[PDB]
Amino acid sequence: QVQLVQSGAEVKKPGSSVKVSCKASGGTFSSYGITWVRQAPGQGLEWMGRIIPILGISRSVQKFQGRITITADKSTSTAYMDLSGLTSDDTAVYYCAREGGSGYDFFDYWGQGTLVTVSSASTKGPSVFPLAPSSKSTSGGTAALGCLVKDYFPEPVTVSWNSGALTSGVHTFPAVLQSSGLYSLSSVVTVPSSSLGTQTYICNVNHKPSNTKVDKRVEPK
Amino acid sequence: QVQLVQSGAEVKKPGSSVKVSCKAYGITWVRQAPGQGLEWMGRIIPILGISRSVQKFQGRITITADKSTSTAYMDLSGLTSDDTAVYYCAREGGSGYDFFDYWGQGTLVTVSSASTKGPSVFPLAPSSKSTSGGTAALGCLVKDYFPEPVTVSWNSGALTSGVHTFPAVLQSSGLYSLSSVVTVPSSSLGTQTYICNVNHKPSNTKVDKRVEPK
Amino acid sequence: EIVLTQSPGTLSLSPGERATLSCRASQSVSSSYLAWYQQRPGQAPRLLIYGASSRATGIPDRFSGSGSGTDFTLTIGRLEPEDSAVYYCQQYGSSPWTFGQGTKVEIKRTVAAPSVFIFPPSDEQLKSGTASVVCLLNNFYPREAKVQWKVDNALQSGNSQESVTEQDSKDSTYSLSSTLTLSKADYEKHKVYACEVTHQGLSSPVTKSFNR
Amino acid sequence: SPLLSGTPPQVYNFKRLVFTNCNYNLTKLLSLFSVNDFTCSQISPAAIASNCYSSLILDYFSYPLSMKSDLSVSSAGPISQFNYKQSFSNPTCLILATVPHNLTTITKPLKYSYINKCSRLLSDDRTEVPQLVNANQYSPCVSIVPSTVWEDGDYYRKQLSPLEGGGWLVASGSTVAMTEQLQMGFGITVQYGTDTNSVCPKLEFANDTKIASQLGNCVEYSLYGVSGRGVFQNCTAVGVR
Numbered sequence: 001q002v003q004l005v006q007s008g009a010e011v012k013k014p015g016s017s018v019k020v021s022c023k024a025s026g027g028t029f030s031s032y033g034i035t036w037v038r039q040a041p042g043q044g045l046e047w048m049g050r051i052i053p054i055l056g057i058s059r060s061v062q063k064f065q066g067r068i069t070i071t072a073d074k075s076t077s078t079a080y081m082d083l084s085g086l087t088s089d090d091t092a093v094y095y096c097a098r099e100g101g102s103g104y105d106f107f108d109y110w111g112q113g114t115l116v117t118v119s120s121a122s123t124k125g126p127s128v129f130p131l132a133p134s135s136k137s138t139s140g141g142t143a144a145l146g147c148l149v150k151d152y153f154p155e156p157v158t159v160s161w162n163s164g165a166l167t168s169g170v171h172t173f174p175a176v177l178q179s180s181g182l183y184s185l186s187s188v189v190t191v192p193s194s195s196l197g198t199q200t201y202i203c204n205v206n207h208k209p210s211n212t213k214v215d216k217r218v219e220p221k
Numbered sequence: 222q223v224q225l226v227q228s229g230a231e232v233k234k235p236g237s238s239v240k241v242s243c244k245a246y247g248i249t250w251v252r253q254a255p256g257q258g259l260e261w262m263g264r265i266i267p268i269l270g271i272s273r274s275v276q277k278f279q280g281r282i283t284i285t286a287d288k289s290t291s292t293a294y295m296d297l298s299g300l301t302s303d304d305t306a307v308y309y310c311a312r313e314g315g316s317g318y319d320f321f322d323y324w325g326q327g328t329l330v331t332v333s334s335a336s337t338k339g340p341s342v343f344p345l346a347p348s349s350k351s352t353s354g355g356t357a358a359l360g361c362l363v364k365d366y367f368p369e370p371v372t373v374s375w376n377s378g379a380l381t382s383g384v385h386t387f388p389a390v391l392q393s394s395g396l397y398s399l400s401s402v403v404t405v406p407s408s409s410l411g412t413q414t415y416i417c418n419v420n421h422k423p424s425n426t427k428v429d430k431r432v433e434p435k
Numbered sequence: 436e437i438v439l440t441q442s443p444g445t446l447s448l449s450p451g452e453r454a455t456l457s458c459r460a461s462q463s464v465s466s467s468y469l470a471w472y473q474q475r476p477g478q479a480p481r482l483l484i485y486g487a488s489s490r491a492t493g494i495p496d497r498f499s500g501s502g503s504g505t506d507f508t509l510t511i512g513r514l515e516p517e518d519s520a521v522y523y524c525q526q527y528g529s530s531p532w533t534f535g536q537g538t539k540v541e542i543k544r545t546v547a548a549p550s551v552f553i554f555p556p557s558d559e560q561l562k563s564g565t566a567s568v569v570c571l572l573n574n575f576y577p578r579e580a581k582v583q584w585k586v587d588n589a590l591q592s593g594n595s596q597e598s599v600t601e602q603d604s605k606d607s608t609y610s611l612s613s614t615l616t617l618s619k620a621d622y623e624k625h626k627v628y629a630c631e632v633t634h635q636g637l638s639s640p641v642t643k644s645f646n647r
Numbered sequence: 648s649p650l651l652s653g654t655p656p657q658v659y660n661f662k663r664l665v666f667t668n669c670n671y672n673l674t675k676l677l678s679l680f681s682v683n684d685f686t687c688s689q690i691s692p693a694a695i696a697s698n699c700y701s702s703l704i705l706d707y708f709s710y711p712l713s714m715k716s717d718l719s720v721s722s723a724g725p726i727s728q729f730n731y732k733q734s735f736s737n738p739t740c741l742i743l744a745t746v747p748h749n750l751t752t753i754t755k756p757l758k759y760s761y762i763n764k765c766s767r768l769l770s771d772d773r774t775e776v777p778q779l780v781n782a783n784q785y786s787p788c789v790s791i792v793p794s795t796v797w798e799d800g801d802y803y804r805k806q807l808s809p810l811e812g813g814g815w816l817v818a819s820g821s822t823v824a825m826t827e828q829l830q831m832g833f834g835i836t837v838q839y840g841t842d843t844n845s846v847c848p849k850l851e852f853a854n855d856t857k858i859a860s861q862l863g864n865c866v867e868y869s870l871y872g873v874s875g876r877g878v879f880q881n882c883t884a885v886g887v888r
Contacts, residue, residue, distance in 0.1 A: 164770020198223055198245060198291075198772050247802050251534075259472075259480070259523065259534040266802050268775050269764060269819050273800040275531045288775055309479055316801040316820070319527035320470040322491060324479035341564055344557030348571075349647065351552060358552040358571060365564070385573065387612045388477075390598040400598065400612040402571060435557070530798055 002028060002109065006096060008208040009115035011123055011154045014088050020114045022096030023078045029053050033099030034072055034079040035107060040092045050099060051079060083116075091118045117154055124153040124182045125210040128203070131218050139194070142169075145218050146188030147203035153182040154209050161189040163204040163215055195220050223323065227310055229422040230329035232337055232368045238298045241328045243310030248286050248293035249321055252278075254306045264313055265293060297330075305332045331368055338367040338396055339424040342417065345432045353408060359432045360402030361417035371421045373401040378418065410434060437462040437529045441536035447543050450514050456538050458507040458524035466503040468528035473498075473520045476601035480523065484509065516542050516607035547608050548636030549575035551582075553629065553643040565619050570630030570643070572611035576602070580634045582613040585642060587625040591615070650707050651679065654754030655831050658718065659730040659762045659786040660794055661708035670849040671703055680744035680831060683712055688720075689738035690837075699847040701840030706731065706783070710832030711759050711823055715743055718832070729765040734782040737838045746829040755829045760796035762788055763819035767807070771815050788818040796820030 007021040022034060036048040049060040053072040060068050067086065072079040079096060093115045097107030126149050133145035149159050152175075161170045169190035175183045191197050201217045228242040241250075247266035253259040264273040267286035274282055283296040293310060308328045311321030340363050347359035363371050375384050380403065389399040405411045414432045421427075440459040448454050458469065469487035472480035482491045484500035487507045497518075502508045507524055519542045524535035550573045556566035572580055578599060584591045597613040613630055629643040649664060656662055673696045685692050708731065710718065717724030720735055733739040746753050765788035766777045780786055791803035801820035807813060858868075862879050 162770065162772050164772055164774050166770075166773055168773070193224075193245075196222075196224065246804075258536050259525075261532050261534070264800070264802070268766070268768065268817055269802060271763065271800055271802065271819050273798075288773065291773070313802065315804050316797060317803070318485065319532055320482050320485045320491075320525075321472075321480075322482055324481065327479060343564060343567070344559050346554040346557050346569065348552040348554055350644075358554075358573070360554070360571070362569065364567075385600060385610050387598040387600045387610070390596055392596050392616070398614075400569075400614075402573075402612070435555075 002026075002030065002032070002098070004096060004098070004109050004111040006094075006111040006114045009117075009154075009156060011117045011119075011209055012086075013120050014118045015085050016118075017082060017084045018086065018116055020081045020083075020094050020096075020116065021078055022080075022111050027077045029072075029074055029077040033101075035097045035099050036070065036081050037095045037097055037107070037110075038092045039095065043092075045095075048094075049081065052099070053077075053079065086116075086118055088118045091116055115155055119181075121181050122153060123209045124151055125212060126150075126152040126157045126205055126207045126214075128205060128214055128216060131203070131216070133218060133220050135221065140192060142190040142192065143194060143220075144188060144190060145220075146186065147205075147216055147218070148184070148186055149205060150184035151178075151180075151182045152184070152207060152210075154207075155183070157185070157205060157207040157210075159185075159187045159203070159205045161187060162199065162202050223312070225310060225312060225323050225325040227308075227325040227328045230331075230368075230370060232331045232333075232423045233300075234334050235302045235332045236299050237332070238296050239300070239330050241295050241297075241308050241310075241330070243293045243295075243325050245291040247313030247315065249311045249313040250284065250293075250295050251309045251311055251321075252304075252306045253309065257306075259309070263295070264319075266313070267291070267293065300330075300332055302332050302334075305330060329369055335395065336367060337423055338365055339426040340366040340371045340419055340421045340428065342419060342428045342430055345417075345430070347432060347434055349435065351408065356404040356406070357408035357411075357434070358402065358404065359434075360400060361419075361430055361432070362398070362400055363419055364398035365396050366398065366421060366424070367396050368421075368423045369397075371399070371419055371424075373399075373417065373419045375401070375403045375416045376413070377416070380416075408434070436531055437464055437526055437533055439524065439526060439533060439535055441524070442538045444537070445539045445541055447541055448514050450516070450542060450544055452514055454511045454514055454518075454540065456509040456522055456524070458502070458509070458535055460505050460507075460526060462529065463504065464526045465528035468526065469500070469507045470525045470527065471498065471500065471509050472523045472525060472534075474523075475520050475604060483522075514542055516544060516602070517604045518542055519602055519604075519607060541602070542607055543577065544607055546635050547574045547576040549573070549580055549611075549632055549634050549641070551630065551632055551641050551643055553645060555628070555645050555647050561619060565616065566622065568615040568617060568628045568645075570613040570615075572613065572630075572632055574606075574608045575599075575611050575632065575634055575636070576608040577635075578609050580609070580611050580632060582611065582630040582632050584613070584615040585627070585629040585631055586615075586617075588627055588629075650705070651752060654756055655707055655709040655829070657730075657756070657760050657795060658708045658710050658726065658832065659789050659792065661706045661731050661785070661834075663783070663785075664705045664707065666703045666705070666846055667701075668845040670851065671846055672849045673697075676833075679750065681747055682742055682744045683830070684715060684743040685740075686742075687738070687740035688735075690740070692740065695738075695740050695835070695837070697848045699844035700837040701844055701846070702838055703846045704836040704838075706733075706834040706836070708832055709756055709759055709829060710743060711826055711830050712743060712745075714761075714823065715832070725763060726761045728779045729762040729788065730780065730786060731834065732780050732782040732784075733834050733836055737836050740835040740837075742833040742835070744831050744833065745826075746831065748828070753829060755825070756795055758795070758822045758825045759830075760820060760822040762786065762792055763821035765818050766816075767812075768815040768817065769812075775817075788816065791816065791818045792820055796822050798822070 003025045012018045031054050033052040035050045038046045038048050049070040051058050051070040051072040053074040069082040093113045095113045096111040098109045129148035129150045131145045131147045137143045171188045173186040175185035177183045203216050205214050226244045233239045249264050250262040251259045252262050262278050263284045265284045265286040267288040286293045310325035312323040343362040343364045345361045351358045383404050385402050387400040389397040391397050417430045419428050438461045442457045467486045467488050471483040474480040483494050483498045487500035497512045499510045521537045523537045552571040554569040560566040584595045595615045599611040628645040631640045631642045717726040769776045791805050799822045803818040805816050
């Protein structure tokens with residue numbers, strides 16, 4: 001079992017050269033091919049290219065020919081896909097998967113994925129909005145308080161409740177495009193404790209383009 | 222800082238299984254006999270899942286701490302009548318630092334095979350002679366309650382000051398009584414005289430009465 | 436298991452006087468492995484000193500941890516009415532960890548004259564329950580206050596039950612609530628119920644009057 | 648001799664002795680400690696006694712006979728997972744031995760102790776991730792644990808520096824009753840060079856194959872890299888000694 005990790009989502013201008021890096025933890029590469037799959041938002045998956053690190057053999061889909069260069073360094077144990085002169089329509093989340101062989105072309109393991117965005121606009125740092133916890137709530141059964149991430153142009157900002165991602169009672173809502181180019185998404189948590197909670201300060205937010213982490217205290221008003 | 226709270230005091234028959242729940246490091250359980258030094262019972266860490274018990278309480282107490290639950294539960298089985306004591310849950314720093322920074326409010330466990338009596342509120346009977354204007358002495362008395370502790374508060378607990386509470390004293394009868402009295406700036410009735418909320422954790426009976434200057 | 440000796444316990448200490456608490460250990464214990472816990476009356480214990488070397492966070496530095504190996508002394512630089520509490524020394528060097536026998540601390544600022552209030556029972560208790568008779572002795576400090584019930588201006592046997600509250604954290608005063616239980620049926624010849632208090636406060640036995 | 652000197656450490660704190668270029672005698676080690684249990688993986692125990700390897704690795708610790716089953720790579724027992732791990736790829740011989748009463752200068756630890764569990768909290772408030780010891784490495788969780796665990800049940804917690812990872816590391820300690828005769832567990836992890844084997848069984852040249860007593864007899868000679876067939880005769884010294 002080799003865990004597969006991928007580079008952070010990158011926003012690129014159209015016609016730029018974009019490199020997506022897929023790596024194996026522990027720096028270990030076996031005799032397994034590395035393949036790239038493209039999923040357009042709300043669309044079916046597509047096969048882009050196949051690279052084997054051991055032999056260095058490279059193959060690409062007919063639609064993406066002469067624009068995609070796929071390189072796998074066996075010693076580095078890291079596989080990189082490069083797209084050159086890509087169109088705006090090309091924006092999609094890219095996944096790296098493990099090949100099994102010529103008669104075994106099934107992808108056993110998949111990388112977390114990298115979202116590539118190709119718009120010539122502007123990148124906006126995430127703006128946190130007031131938690132505004134509801135004054136009226138269940139008496140200890142549940143309390144609703146949510147820090148809101150708004151006005152961020154490039155997906156995806158990852159906002160984790162409790163500063164360490166709390167699995168219990170976490171709700172994340174998919175970003176919906178605003179009339180302005182920037183779009184906003186919603187994060188809310190439910191806490192049994194009426195006031196204070198285990199930690200007064202939580203709501204860690206991470207944005208890959210901004211590279212800024214913000215944590216804010218929650219106050220019952 | 223994590224606040225520590227404990228389950229309401231429960232009256233149990235001897236040979237029962239009391240599950241005292243300490244709601245949200247390590248959790249330590251201490252038993253204090255009335256008018257006696259505290260005794261450490263066990264050290265359970267929710268994250269580790271490890272369980273430790275004192276030699277005297279071994280094989281009779283099952284202590285379970287779960288990180289996912291975030292609540293520590295202690296179960297005592299076949300406990301003797303003499304075991305009745307107030308139980309406190311205390312946060313544990315670790316084996317290197319066995320000191321308890323935060324202590325739970327506490328749960329009183331009573332183990333007598335007798336009867337449980339609902340609280341009875343006796344007449345306030347405010348003194349006919351008291352200070353004319355400086356203070357008026359009126360108190361609602363709770364009497365004939367078998368199991369401790371009934372909690373009585375003036376102004377529904379709003380008045381945390383000017384209220385005198387007297388510890389229950391055993392009479393010849395098994396049932397025991399305690400006294401609550403308050404001082405009011407207005408000698409004649411005052412703006413609000415509907416008070417005396419009483420809560421009995423075992424009985425679950427709440428009585429509220431109004432004071433009248435007689 | 437280490438058995439540990441403790442100071443005698445209740446002591447009368449004026450405010451502004453240093454207080455010393457002794458925690459000798461019968462069996463040898465680590466030079467710095469002792470914890471002091473202070474519990475206010477009807478309140479859970481709070482750690483004051485950890486390791487008998489440094490005060491806990493949020494704890495006043497007036498309490499000081501001193502001594503090593505066998506005897507551990509807790510010294511308080513200044514005494515306040517809110518310093519009155521039971522103090523326990525716990526040794527965690529040997530398992531099972533053993534708590535101290537504990538020492539009660541009493542702070543006396545001044546003698547307080549008692550105020551006596553007599554409560555005459557209402558007719559509602561006659562309908563159900565026992566009417567009884569109740570006497571209040573507010574602010575009767577120190578604890579040594581004695582009340583004897585008087586029935587119909589005649590001597591009454593001391594079968595009365597009296598409860599005295601612990602000193603308040605700021606007030607530092609003791610209040611007493613003596614009660615007399617009498618049969619609801621037996622309320623005919625007796626016309627006056629009184630409690631007589633003998634105390635340092637007040638000129639003489641302050642008796643009382645019911646009539647009604 | 649370094650293994651004999653001092654008191655053997657706990658399984659988590661096992662000391663490591665590595666021999667790269669010396670002749671080795673298995674019998675000499677066996678003579679010092681009676682072997683209660685002998686097991687080997689990927690090679691025969693008899694084969695290990697007399698074969699050359701590029702290098703020899705020996706790990707020595709005090710391990711009781713009762714918990715031997717728990718300390719196995721195949722076993723899912725906690726002692727193997729949180730204390731000592733032997734690499735599967737190189738052939739490993741595992742020996743459990745009991746000190747003889749006759750043997751002296753072997754100090755005995757108060758009681759045998761092991762790390763009951765080793766874990767790091769990814770998130771302090773509600774997230775705990777178990778950490779399994781990598782092969783050997785002297786135990787990462789060993790820093791919190793003392794050389795000998797103080798109590799059968801112990802709680803150890805420490806905080807990693809933030810950035811990174813700013814996550815609490817927690818360990819547990821468990822102890823077992825000391826045996827009247829000290830019991831020590833030895834793990835051997837030999838590896839073979841493709842063309843070179845520096846460590847070989849004693850001895851490279853046999854005592855019987857010596858010039859003395861072969862005088863007057865035609866014999867094949869291999870002295871200091873000079874190989875020929877010749878007859879040796881004792882005579883007065885001539886030339887530079």
